Amino acid sequence: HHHHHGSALQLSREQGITLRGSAEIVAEFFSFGINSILYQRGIYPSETFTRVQKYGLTLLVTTDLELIKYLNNVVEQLKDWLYKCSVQKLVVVISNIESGEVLERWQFDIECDKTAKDDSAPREKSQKAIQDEIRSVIRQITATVTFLPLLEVSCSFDLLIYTDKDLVVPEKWEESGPQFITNSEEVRLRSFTTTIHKVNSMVAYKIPVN
């Protein structure tokens, strides 16, 4: 069972959360989630983004055609894997564009219910209830600015996926390592759950030197 069903009336109209619908919710989140990190940690110029209403907040998403096209491929793929419960982690690695030194690493742990595919009926949780949990995560990600180390140099980012050793991955994806920061500190953030998938967020940064 579980605890934050949402409005009974809303629920009566929506019916519930199915495995596929959960997969979209979660993939959609990584779309906004990534756009948000890239924007607030200034990985890309701020004039590069544009305002949008989502989750009851005003978020910023990229305007760069190539990036836009890129994230979509990730999202759509992330969507397939989530339906089948194949991806366990999604990591955004941030590093020095020149040296290559990893300076900050955002980690997302995904928990999925293997049995959801055999449900007799949709799970009792409103769309709005799930959005409120997500909005709570995004605000925290924002408040993160005060203590995180400033990223003075020019950075780039990379997307890492962590799954089960029997996944046939597309050509665009290449084998890799965890890419941990050699010496760090980390803060565990809030999570949200669609009652089918659960996402835990956390951020690690290199410990300030000199």
């Binding site: 990036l67 780039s156 994806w173 890799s176």
Partner: peptide
Amino acid sequence: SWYSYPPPQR
């Protein structure tokens, strides 16, 4: 197992 898919080279 880890897999990477890098964004376009700015």
